[PDB]
Amino acid sequence: AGGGVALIRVASKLADLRGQNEDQNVGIKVALRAMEAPLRQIVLNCGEEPSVVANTVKGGDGNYGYNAATEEYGNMIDMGILDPTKVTRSALQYAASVAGLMITTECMVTDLP
């Protein structure tokens, strides 16, 4: 399902996911909260409240989501708004990759101005 609903749908299913310690648990929630950002941004550009739409999409199940073009809710696959699984997967993995590197960065070296 497109319009960033696949990410928020997946994120809602992993509420019980935990790690080996509390810092890892926070790391999990940081990632799950971040998966709402694409949808929330799309909704913000429409001029609607992201919190309200994100909350409504999470309440539903499956490919239910918010059609940003028509500003109506419904099945995103039936409405013809979909991304290839490869682009959503790649986008998430590559985003998380660099975020992990920057989070674990303690030093930077560059030329003087």
Add this chain to the structure above:
Amino acid sequence: AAKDVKFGNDARVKMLRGVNVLADAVKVTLGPKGRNVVLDKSFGAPTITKDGVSVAREIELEDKFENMGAQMVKEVASKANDAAGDGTTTATVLAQAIITEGLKAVACGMNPMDLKRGIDKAVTAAVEELKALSVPCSDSKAIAQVGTISANSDETVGKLIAEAMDKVGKEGVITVEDGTGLQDELDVVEGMQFDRGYLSPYFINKPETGAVELESPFILLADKKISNIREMLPVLEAVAKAGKPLLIIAEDVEGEALATLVVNTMRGIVKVAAVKAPGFGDRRKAMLQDIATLTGGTVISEEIGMELEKATLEDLGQAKRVVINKDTTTIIDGVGEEAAIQGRVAQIRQQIEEATSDYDREKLQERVAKLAGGVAVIKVGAATEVEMKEKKARVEDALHATRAAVEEGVVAGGGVALIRVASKLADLRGQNEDQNVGIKVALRAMEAPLRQIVLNCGEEPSVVANTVKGGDGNYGYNAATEEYGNMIDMGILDPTKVTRSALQYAASVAGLMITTECMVTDLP
């Protein structure tokens, strides 16, 4: 002195900046999850508080134009508190919301006069819709429930107020005093109340309530304007000997008489308070004699030929206690004889029969009701002094809220009554598009109190506001428990009078600021 004059947008942004500083400082205290505000003092440690009235009082800004902005909204917000006993915070956040979106619409290019008219129409409609939503508070069961809720789920306070109102009536006079032991008391005494406050703020010796309180005072009664204190000298010196305070009930106290009394009391030479006599014209002189018979004194009028220089302690009336608000004076337990008081009631009660006019009849009925009705005196008891003072505070606040509930009923609390009303007026329109915007500005502003409460809880205001609007009636969001449901059943309610007053006073000043094109003040 030379002035600084600003115009239009340049002047409006200054006021907006000013009211934002006041509103933002006050609105953090709103709701059950309200935040603390630390108010500094010159001596000692700072005051930590969640009281929006206490916070508001301190707010004064350096920028002259910004200050004017804040002081304008702050004045009308306190009138809501004087009228209904609550809603300073609520009125300040409502004012901010109307002003912010209003002044934005003025910069948009829309007509300020139409924006104001649209806001006023939306408020007028909202107040009527608010009365429909209002649940009455008639029987003494409901009076107890409202008093109980207002005193933080203390059934003893609701019991006290219900019993007190049962004695002297719903519109009767009730006063709270310090107890003399563990158990509470309730006594009816010869007393009176009239709508005339103190003539100067510097008579106040109880800054918490903001009222003058004199114990075992003498009461001077004079049908005349006291401008000079030279006439008062023989009276004031006679009062000072017995070691008791004084209450001046005259036509007025102006200039040098008022200024000298303020200096004498503030330094602490002789305790005194000055108030105007009730009413005006002929009925003023009639009501002055009611007080004289009640307190057991004598009226000193220039007409008959009696001077203040020749007055003595015997002419002065007396009582056990008196209380004076910004716009109220109360006399508790008068020394006057029962024969004289009952005799005066018989005179006025006969005049009701002889009365030809209705207006004449109605005013005579008010004079006997004040005199023959008396005053209820609740004495709050507790185990220790700290518990007695804390309980007494909850009784006074519950008594104010209960009165307002009895007058105009109660509505759903936590700012849901305003958003409920606002959702019902979606189809409300005006004469033109600028007025239509003015209406929507007002309806959007009515969500601000709830949205603020929800923000202080740490939840998303949009989500909660949207859910409350979806429902009907007294359905709302309980900010304390963070659960939805019927707000009246859950025991979260405001008197209709406080919500109404808060909205009307907020919209009043917002309308004035929106329609302001010029500001004048002294140079820095």
Add this chain to the structure above:
Amino acid sequence: AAKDVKFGNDARVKMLRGVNVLADAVKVTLGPKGRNVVLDKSFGAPTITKDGVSVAREIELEDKFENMGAQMVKEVASKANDAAGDGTTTATVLAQAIITEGLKAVACGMNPMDLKRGIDKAVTAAVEELKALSVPCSDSKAIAQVGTISANSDETVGKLIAEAMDKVGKEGVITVEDGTGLQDELDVVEGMQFDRGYLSPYFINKPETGAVELESPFILLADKKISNIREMLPVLEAVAKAGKPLLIIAEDVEGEALATLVVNTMRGIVKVAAVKAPGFGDRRKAMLQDIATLTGGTVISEEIGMELEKATLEDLGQAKRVVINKDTTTIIDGVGEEAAIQGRVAQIRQQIEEATSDYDREKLQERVAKLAGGVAVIKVGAATEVEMKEKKARVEDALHATRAAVEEGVVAGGGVALIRVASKLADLRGQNEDQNVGIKVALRAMEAPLRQIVLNCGEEPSVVANTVKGGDGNYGYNAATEEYGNMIDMGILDPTKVTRSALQYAASVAGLMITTECMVTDLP
């Protein structure tokens, strides 16, 4: 005046900065290897001290917001000292630790209201766990041991306190005085104590203890509010002739009467002290007569018809000495006759038999216990005057610590009781993750006192804190000897009351600061 208003993070970092300056200045004195703090004076040489109370008192910052921060925590920290007799330093370091990690968690994005609730739950649990760890202090052997430890291993002080408490009881009144020779003394005299402190700080003539001390004073007793000093003139002039100080026990002393007395005493014309009468209501008037019979004077009430203008030296009661704390007044060796006092005891003891209610019975038992119980008077002897003053100080401090030990027992000292308790609450959770963080913030903060003590020794706090947590019970690190072992056996212990009070008062203000969103103060 115009105000400076700050909000949220901007306001919180100001308070954090302020409490850090206070805490860092005070916490260097903590522990047996505590460091010196040099406090400057305008005249003479500076004061070198290791007393956190003396250091704290001086702390005032230039930045208005930072000062507010420091003055907030400083107020509640001194309440722990007033309640338990010790723990200002400990409360200040605990407050800093909770605030630092708390305000960090607020910047993190976590809910301040949940953080506070988690802290409070952790403290409530910690206090219960602290009571379990507490070793009682019942018999007079244990009372001597605690007094001995508190007086720096002086067995003579423990012997004195044990014998004193054996005379008047555990909850009885004990006072320390200057000796008249080498050998110590202990005498029981007709006296009383009640929970009413001085009405103004400027009556204090002993700034070390911070208390009013009057020798051979007269005692005025009046059942009335004394607002004007005009009524006191004939009494004050009569007192001045005999050349003795005065004690005012009235309902209250307000405004001009209080202000004028403060000026007269401070200049040094006539020595006077003012205190409220004990209790309130009807029992206040009963307890005023207990003092009158004890001191051998007469009550001056307006009800019977007695005025302060007509009072004479014969009506005034008298004693040998009186002491007045921030919230306590003590009367030592009253002049009143044995026949009158024993007669008054017989009256009240008969009323206990006639008492229908339990509450009425319990208060009557308190009045006879105060009156018939008397006051123990320890007179500390020594060879020279310097040794007598130094010993007397150790007796007073040991007496405060011993009292607190008798009330709530003793726990392991050197900050190990807090870390021991904290290790036991690892599994403690709340309703949500923000509360869980709040709990861990509090549990981590309980290590701060020990970690600070270890830091002053020059050892690694992490290593010692880790080793203490590994052990069980009263096992801990002796900071003096730098050896591990049983802290109670090694003679390093705090009264449970001081550790409890320090933690609760520290957590109180930390909770308030964490939940603060706005600050208001005057412009610089």
Add this chain to the structure above:
Amino acid sequence: AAKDVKFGNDARVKMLRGVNVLADAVKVTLGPKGRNVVLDKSFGAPTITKDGVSVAREIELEDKFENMGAQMVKEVASKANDAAGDGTTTATVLAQAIITEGLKAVACGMNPMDLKRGIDKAVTAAVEELKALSVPCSDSKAIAQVGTISANSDETVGKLIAEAMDKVGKEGVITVEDGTGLQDELDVVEGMQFDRGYLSPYFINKPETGAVELESPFILLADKKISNIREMLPVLEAVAKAGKPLLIIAEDVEGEALATLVVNTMRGIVKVAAVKAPGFGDRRKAMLQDIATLTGGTVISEEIGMELEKATLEDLGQAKRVVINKDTTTIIDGVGEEAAIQGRVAQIRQQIEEATSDYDREKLQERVAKLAGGVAVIKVGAATEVEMKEKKARVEDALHATRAAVEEGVVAGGGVALIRVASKLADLRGQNEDQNVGIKVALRAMEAPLRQIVLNCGEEPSVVANTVKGGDGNYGYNAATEEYGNMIDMGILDPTKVTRSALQYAASVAGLMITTECMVTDLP
């Protein structure tokens, strides 16, 4: 290079500032009472002009973001001029008006996407209403009248254009040339025109019209992409010997071939111009052979096996004159034989009969119409050379306006057609209130051209705009005579195409700027 990035309001006010500087500079020239604009030059005296196109061209701002604003609107405004032959000034004032009120509404808090959609709906409706108001221009009487009005009331110019269009048809090709005497001429010759402009601006040798003009040129025809100039060397050197210019009609000319030709022509070694071949795919190769037969040359394709290195002057086609616009190429009086041309027409005319598809039939009809239709050549005569050049300019401008009138008719001039249309769409609404505002923004913007014209006259725009709206049809304000009346009868009219194009292109860029949230440019 490092970039300067701005967002939202901060970025929008920069664009608004930029388009205001362009618009204000250009809009002073609008109307018959238009004001002069002095454009500076590095050498010689400045240029005084009332041409908004000339003024616009010069506008470039220092601030990078402001410049972007101006350069955006300036690009789309010139497209209206390229399409319809007029309306750069009009489009710039319309753009300013939509942008100013649009960006204001964005700062209001309204949705930019809805504002744009409302504007577009208003324009779509306006264009349809504009077509209804449009008076057709069909017969040759009306064609003369429009040409006469466009040439400043010169009936000789209208006569020339009417006769020219009567010869080659309404959609036929017409060209203007310098006369050879006093009397005018009109001749039809073998020629063609196709929609392919110059490949680089630096071929332009007539900067007034902004077009390439070559006299007695050779014409190279190649069915290939010419990237390298190494292949052209034997051809270019052969052309240089005869002392004549060259026209390159290839598939494309890219990179080094184009860059080297631009340098060679600009320095003035050999005159050359490069253009793409008409169409694409198979029909491109067909139309290249039409030109070869017309001009009397040979096509050089890689498919058959012919190289540009082996090409000679005989293979090159030839004509008397050629003209090349930004997006048009015209070939005038081809050398090709009448037998070959008529033979080629017979071939394609037979293919129309053999054509199975409609699309195939329609495109074959276009090829014969271009080839067999020919080109009209108006030669403008006058007494002196100064009069001949001035008249020739008026003929070309009148020919552009007449063309546009024949295509889509004519509407009332002086900006009254826009305000007339705008008054008819008062009831037009959208899906929500933000779209409704977007509609009104567009309708209010349509008054700007008239209001500007009236302002330049020195009259009050509000008064005139209000009077024109009150009337109906083609009633309007004649800015030249300062009298009201029927604008079509008074001889003040624009082609419907220029008013339509100006409005659509203005609304296009305004919609883009309104919906812009970010800007990126190089640092200063």
